[PDB]
Design a protein around this ligand. Structure first.
Ligand SMILES: *[C@@H]1O[C@H](CO)[C@@H](O[C@@H]2O[C@H](CO)[C@@H](O[C@@H]3O[C@H](CO)[C@@H](O[C@H]4O[C@H](CO)[C@@H](O)[C@H](O)[C@H]4NC(C)=O)[C@H](O)[C@H]3NC(C)=O)[C@H](O)[C@H]2NC(C)=O)[C@H](O)[C@H]1NC(C)=O
Ligand SMILES: *[C@@H]1O[C@H](CO)[C@@H](O[C@@H]2O[C@H](CO)[C@@H](O)[C@H](O)[C@H]2NC(C)=O)[C@H](O)[C@H]1NC(C)=O
Ligand SMILES: *[C@@H]1O[C@H](CO)[C@@H](O[C@@H]2O[C@H](CO)[C@@H](O)[C@H](O)[C@H]2NC(C)=O)[C@H](O)[C@H]1NC(C)=O
Ligand SMILES: CC(=O)N[C@@H]1[C@@H](O)[C@H](O)[C@@H](CO)O[C@H]1O
Ligand SMILES: [Ca+2]
Lengths: 216, 423
């Protein structure tokens, strides 16, 4: 039935909530969370980071099919996000909330990944937003790395270094998948949820919502 | 009461041998001299036993030499104690790969409570990686690969004392020992103020000398003495009063001196450098030649002493005429004594035109107690300070030292007392 959240929205389903979608050109279904009551309305949360919840340091394959319930935080699964993107043309909006008591987003004009035999290389273009003037996600998208997914450029392994899977450069200005640190421990931490250009290298965000749409 | 002087044979370790030397000049320290890794400062340091053999070029000092090619686990933070009557005294430093990737542009940095400071790092062997700063062995922050400064700074406006330590710098991927070190030293009070609550003024010091915010005196730079450090020692000397000759032929062209923490580690007056291999451009002169000769009537600026005014005039800059000041001399003092257990009144009589005062005159017991005069005399020439000691008994025998320190220099002369017992 429903491929992505836009199709849910246009189907008048305008209500923030969990929905079941189906892979394009296939008969496989992957559940997720749609953010209708939001911006334009109709976003497909590919990830959230609201509290401790379930970790992220997981098998490369786990970051492949996804993990975590969509009720709270989760990752959905690169493969779905990989195909679901080359179908049409999607953007990407990254929104995060800090402890002190602020919040900002970042909007990419176009986003998509690649073949598993290409390590799901990310590609982001046309950057806008309030959380930076420079793409916090390492330009020239690198391969997605994991505990056992050394496909980065550090002469070392950023994943085992920064905890969790992410498009690490030689350990870039970002990693939204890194040890959820509490209120009074949200500073001078390396393996923490950081988006650099909006806070600091030592900051560990309190919230982290990554979501996508096409151009409805 | 305790003149310790740690020596760092070039903090930048290479294929060549390096060493540490903790010299105690003046006092025959009782509590044994220590040397070793200052584990607290640079944390996560590897715990290796470093042999501390004795040195025989100077009267009382232990050394630590890391033999060529063997110099592998030498990076980090070392120090060395002294200990006088129950109290302490330590001097800290660092040892780092000469190679590495960055370079401190200075080993130490002294500031007063509330100075905006810039802990820098010269980028040298640029790699396709990220930058990371590490205080004490703890992570602070990093710099993203594509925008890594040229002179990697670290800004801390209004530095407090608990904000000092050892800031490091390494390209993300690399040993916690391939890092580059540098110490920042903040003192409890602000410039020129010392005190149990910083409500007293420091004995203003010249020739780049720092002031101990615990006592009020200055820790002169290796090359000058005097209550204000205005006195230019013998060319190529060092030591609380100068009685220590820099060894190596070219003056001190390779010694990085370190004094008690309120000061730090600077080259000896006359050399610029990180290894102090460089003499000084004309016009400047102090330690690390941070001193600019503002010699008035255009006099010779000596890269060690300063201005060499014409006869008839003296002054840091020759800005004053007057009878030339002559340092003190502890005159007329026996080498032995032989006294009987009882009321005892030692006396130090000392010369010098800037003439000492009981403020400036002491007598130091062997164990290290400082003793002040009970009554002061005075005369045409020479100051007579009489000390009084309750009941001096046999165990006090040893080597006492009359010590005078005015604004024209410091001087110590020992004598051997031998309290016997009356039948
Ligand atoms: C380099 O910089 C790091 C910080 O970046 C310093 O390390 C931290 O230092 C702080 C300040 O002292 C220290 O905080 C102390 O934490 C302990 C326990 O968490 C508390 O307990 C102390 O008293 C109890 C008795 O009730 C003892 O049982 C503990 O052993 C004792 N703490 C210790 C181990 O010394 C202290 O009360 C608390 N201080 C206060 C009052 O705030 C952190 O524990 C240190 N953490 C780290 C990362 O090591 C480091 O000291 C510094 N190095 C230097 C000296 O420059
Ligand atoms: C300082 O006090 C000392 C000790 O109380 C005095 O020194 C003695 O002076 C007499 C002369 O009055 C000499 O004969 C002795 O030889 C001195 N004692 C010693 C050290 O041997 C002296 O009165 C005082 N000095 C001055 C000049 O005021
Ligand atoms: C302090 O001086 C006395 C002077 O008598 C020293 O005593 C002895 O001096 C003779 C002189 O030739 C030596 O042969 C001995 O070695 C000394 N005997 C002792 C007690 O060791 C005494 O040694 C001196 N002490 C110091 C620290 O110099
Ligand atoms: C060059 C630079 O940007 N670094 C600054 C420096 O200019 C300034 O003197 C210092 C103290 O305010 O703070 C830092
Ligand atoms: Ca790698």
């Amino acid at each position: 039935e429903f491929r992505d959240c836009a199709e849910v929205f246009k189907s008048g389903h305008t209500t923030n909530g969990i929905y079941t979608l189906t892979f394009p050109n296939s008969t496989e279904e992957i559940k997720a969370y749609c953010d209708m009551e939001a911006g334009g309305g109709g976003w497909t949360i590919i990830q959230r980071r609201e509290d401790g919840s379930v970790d992220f340091q997981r098998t490369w394959k786990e970051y492949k099919v996804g993990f975590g319930n969509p009720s709270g935080e989760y990752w959905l699964g690169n493969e779905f996000v990989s195909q679901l993107t080359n179908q049409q043309r999607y953007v990407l909006k990254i929104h995060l909330k800090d402890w002190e008591g602020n919040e900002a987003y970042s909007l990419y004009e176009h986003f998509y990944l690649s073949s598993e035999e290409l390590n799901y290389r990310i590609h982001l273009k046309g950057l806008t937003g309030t959380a930076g003037k420079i793409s916090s996600i390492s330009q020239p998208g690198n391969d997605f790395s994991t505990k056992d997914g050394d496909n980065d450029k550090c002469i070392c392994k950023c994943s085992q270094m920064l905890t969790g899977g992410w498009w690490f450069d030689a350990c870039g200005p970002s990693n939204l998948n890194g040890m959820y640190y509490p209120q009074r421990q949200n500073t001078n931490k390396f393996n923490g949820i950081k988006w650099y250009y909006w806070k600091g290298s030592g900051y560990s965000l309190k919230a982290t919502t990554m979501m996508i749409r096409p151009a409805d | 009461a305790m003149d310790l002087i740690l020596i760092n044979s070039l903090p930048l370790v290479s294929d060549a041998e390096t060493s540490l030397t903790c010299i105690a000049s003046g006092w025959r320290p009782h509590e044994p001299i220590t040397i070793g890794r200052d584990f607290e400062a640079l944390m996560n340091q590897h715990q290796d036993p470093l042999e501390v053999t004795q040195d025989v070029t100077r009267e009382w000092a232990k050394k630590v030499v890391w033999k060529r090619e063997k110099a592998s686990k030498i990076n980090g933070a070392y120090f060395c104690e002294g200990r006088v009557r129950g109290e302490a005294i330590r001097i800290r430093t660092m040892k780092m790969r000469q190679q590495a990737s960055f370079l401190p542009a200075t080993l130490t940095m002294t500031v007063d409570k509330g100075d905006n400071v810039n802990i820098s790092f010269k980028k040298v062997l640029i790699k396709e990686e990220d930058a990371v700063i590490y205080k004490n062995g703890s992570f602070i922050h990093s710099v993203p690969r594509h925008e890594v400064p040229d002179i990697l700074e670290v800004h801390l406006p209004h530095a407090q004392p608990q904000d000092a330590g050892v800031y490091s710098a390494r390209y993300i991927g690399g040993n916690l020992f391939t890092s580059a070190f540098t110490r920042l030293i903040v003192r409890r009070c602000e410039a020129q103020k010392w005190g149990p609550e910083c409500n007293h003024l420091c004995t203003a010091c010249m020739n780049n000398g720092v002031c101990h915010e615990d006592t009020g005196e200055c820790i002169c730079p290796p090359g000058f003495m005097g209550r204000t450090c205005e006195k230019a020692c013998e060319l190529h000397t060092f030591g609380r009063t100068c009685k220590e000759r820099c060894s190596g032929q070219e003056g001190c062209k390779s010694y990085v001196f370190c004094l008690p923490d309120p000061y730090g580690c600077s080259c000896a007056t006359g050399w610029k450098g990180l290894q102090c291999n460089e003499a000084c451009h004309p016009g400047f002169y102090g330690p690390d030649c941070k001193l600019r000769c503002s010699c008035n009537n255009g006099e010779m600026c000596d890269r060690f002493q300063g201005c060499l005014c014409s006869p008839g005039w003296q002054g840091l800059q020759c800005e004053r005429e007057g009878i030339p000041r002559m340092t003190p001399k502890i005159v007329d003092l026996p080498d032995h004594i032989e006294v009987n257990s009882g009321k005892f009144n030692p006396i130090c009589k000392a010369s010098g035109w800037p003439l000492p005062t009981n403020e400036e005159m002491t007598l130091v017991k062997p164990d290290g107690t400082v003793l002040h005069p009970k009554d002061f005399n005075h005369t045409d020439h020479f100051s007579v300070a009489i000390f009084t000691i309750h009941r001096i008994l046999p165990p006090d025998s040893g080597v006492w030292v009359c010590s005078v320190n005015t604004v024209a220099g410091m001087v110590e002369k020992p004598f051997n007392i031998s309290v016997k017992v009356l039948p």
